[PDB]
C-alpha cells in the first residue's frame, strides 16, 4: 500500500540517479534491518550518489550489549577492502544512531533471489549457483590471506551489485588472528552457518568459513540449508544438534562434481575439510567443479554474470517486511555507552 509507494519513491530516485548528520543525506526506505539497527538507502546531496547507511541504534546497542560487535565491524571494514568486500566511505554519528556509510549493492541479496527467481520453483539452476560459489571463494580467500576468520557467511550477507556479480560483506562477527595463534575459541556467527567446532566452544582455525561456504552453495541450489527443510528453520538448540550430528543429504539436481565439492566443504573435522590448511586456497580450486569456470577472468571481473539485475525494479527488501528488534523500555544510557558513541564517530 504505502509500502509499495515508498518502494516506488525509491525507484523514482534511482531513475534520477541513473540519469555528518541527517542534514547531509536525504533518506529513503529501509533495505533491511542488519545485525545492529537499520540499513537504509540514502543519498548525498553534494554529489547525488546513493549509499546504504548501516545505522546502529543507540537503544538497540544498549539492549543487546552490542558494543564489541560495532567496533569490530568498523575497524575491520575500514582497513580491509577488495573487489568482493564492500567499500566503507564514511563513519560519522547522528542524533540517535552511529552510522557506517558503505557503497550500494542495489541488486538485492542472494537470499532474496532464491525465492524471487520463481516463487513455485525456488533455488537456482546449476550454472548460476556454480558461478556464485566461485565468486564467494575469491572473497573468502581475500579474508584468509589477511589471516581473518569471518566465523559467518550466509546468503543475506552476500549482496549482488547492479551487474550481477556477488560480494561478501559484514566483517563484524570476525576476528583477526595475530601471529602466535592459529586457532581461537568463540561462538561467533549465526546458527546453521556455524561449524561444529564453533558450537562445541572448541578452538578452530580458518576452517569454519569453508563450512559456511558449503552451507551457502547447498542453499543456493536446493533452496534450503543442509541442516533445515524448505521454508523452515528450526530453533537454535535443534539447529546446533543438526550441524553436529546430521550427515548432508542431496538430490540428483546436483551434478557429481558439485555434489562431491559440497561434501568436501561440509565435512566435519578441520583436517579433512577442503579449503585453507595453511598451504594454499588454490587446492580447493583444483576440484573438477571449476572446469566450467576460468579463475583468471573471474578475478578480473570479465566473466558475464548468469543473472543481471534490473536497474528499474529494485530487489531490496520491502519496508515493513524487514527485520526488527525492540527499542528500550525506559532504559537510560550509561556513561560508558556515551563514551563509545563519541569514539565511534570519526
Amino acid at each position, epitope marked *: 500500500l504505502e509500502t509499495v509507494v515508498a518502494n516506488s519513491a525509491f525507484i523514482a530516485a534511482r531513475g534520477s540517479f541513473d540519469a555528518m548528520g541527517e542534514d547531509w543525506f536525504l533518506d529513503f526506505r529501509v533495505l533491511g534491518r542488519g545485525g545492529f539497527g537499520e540499513v537504509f538507502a540514502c543519498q548525498m546531496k553534494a554529489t547525488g550518489k546513493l549509499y546504504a547507511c548501516k545505522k546502529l541504534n543507540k537503544k538497540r546497542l544498549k539492549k543487546r550489549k552490542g558494543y564489541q560487535g560495532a567496533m569490530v565491524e568498523k575497524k575491520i571494514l575500514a582497513k580491509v577492502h577488495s573487489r568482493f568486500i564492500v567499500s566503507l566511505a564514511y563513519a560519522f554519528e547522528t542524533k540517535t544512531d552511529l552510522c557506517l556509510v558503505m557503497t550500494i549493492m542495489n541488486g538485492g541479496d542472494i537470499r532474496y533471489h532464491i525465492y524471487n527467481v520463481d516463487e513455485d520453483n525456488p533455488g537456482f539452476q546449476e550454472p548460476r549457483a556454480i558461478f556464485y560459489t566461485a565468486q564467494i571463494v575469491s572473497g573468502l580467500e581475500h579474508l584468509h590471506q589477511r589471516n581473518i576468520i569471518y566465523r559467518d557467511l550466509k546468503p543475506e550477507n552476500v549482496l549482488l551489485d547492479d551487474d550481477g556479480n556477488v560480494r561478501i560483506s559484514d566483517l563484524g562477527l570476525a576476528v583477526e588472528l595475530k601471529a602466535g595463534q592459529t586457532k581461537t575459541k568463540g561462538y561467533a556467527g549465526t546458527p546453521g552457518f556455524m561449524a561444529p567446532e564453533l558450537l562445541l566452544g572448541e578452538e578452530y582455525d580458518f576452517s569454519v568459513d569453508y563450512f559456511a561456504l558449503g552451507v551457502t552453495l547447498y542453499e543456493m541450489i536446493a533452496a534450503r540449508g543442509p541442516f533445515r527443510a524448505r521454508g523452515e528453520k528450526v530453533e537454535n538448540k535443534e539447529l546446533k544438534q543438526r550441524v553436529l550430528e546430521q550427515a548432508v543429504t542431496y538430490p*540428483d539436481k546436483f*551434478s*557429481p*562434481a558439485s555434489k*562431491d565439492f559440497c561434501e568436501a566443504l561440509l565435512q566435519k573435522d578441520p583436517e579433512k575439510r577442503l579449503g585453507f590448511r595453511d598451504g594454499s586456497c588454490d587446492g580447493l580450486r583444483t576440484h573438477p567443479l571449476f572446469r*566450467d569456470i576460468s579463475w583468471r577472468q573471474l578475478e578480473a571481473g570479465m566473466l558475464t554474470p548468469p543473472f543481471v539485475p534490473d536497474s528499474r525494479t529494485v530487489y531490496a527488501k520491502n519496508i515493513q517486511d524487514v527485520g526488527a528488534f525492540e527499542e528500550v523500555k525506559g532504559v537510560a544510557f550509561e556513561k560508558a555507552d556515551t563514551e563509545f558513541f563519541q569514539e565511534f564517530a570519526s
Partner: antibody
Amino acid sequence: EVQLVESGGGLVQPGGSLRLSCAASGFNFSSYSIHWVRQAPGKGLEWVAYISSYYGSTYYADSVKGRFTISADTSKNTAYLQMNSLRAEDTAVYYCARHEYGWWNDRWGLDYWGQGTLVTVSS
Amino acid sequence: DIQMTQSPSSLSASVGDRVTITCRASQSVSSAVAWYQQKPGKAPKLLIYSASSLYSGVPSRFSGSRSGTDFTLTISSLQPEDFATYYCQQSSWYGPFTFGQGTKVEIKR
C-alpha cells in the same frame, strides 16, 4: 576414441569366470565412464553397469544384479567385469562405452563403441 | 529404470522419402537422449546426442528435434544404406541408461 578393443574373448562355461577387459586408449579415463554395453547377436543394444574413475559411483542394470562385479583401473584405463554367474544371455560381442561427463550438467550419448571380440557362454 | 518406447515398430519407405521416427520416454529425462544406427555385424554409430544435437562425422540428413518426453529423429532424404534398426536411448549422469526396442526402416520396392 574407437580404440576400445575387447581382449577378454574366448568361450567360458556357464557360471564360470572370465575377466572381460577393455584395451582403452587414446583418452584419459576420469572424464568418461566405461560402462559395459553389450550388442547381443541379432538383438538390440543394452546396458550392464556403470563404471567411474574418481567419482566411484557404480550401479547395475536390474537384470545383471550381482552376476558381475564391476572393477576399474586408471593405470591402463582397463575396466574389468568379473564373471561369476552366467546364463546364455551373457553371449554378446561386448563393447566398451565411452560417455562424456557434463560441461554444466550435460548428458550425452555414447560417443564410441568397441570393435568387439565375441564372448560366448555355452556348454 | 526409464522405459524407452519406439514408434513406429517398423516402417517401409522408398529411397528419397522424408522419414521421421518418434521415441517416447516414460519419464522426462530432460535433454539427454541419443539416437543410434545399428546395421548387423557393425559397431553402433551415434547419430544424435542431447535429443537434437548432431554427432560429428554423421551426415546432415540426420537431424533430431524435440524435448520433454517426445523425442524425434528425422532423415530428410532416405538412402538405400538407411536400411537399419534405429535405437533411442535415455542417458543420465547419476541414473540408469536404457535403450529402445528399435525402429526397423525397410527399403521399399
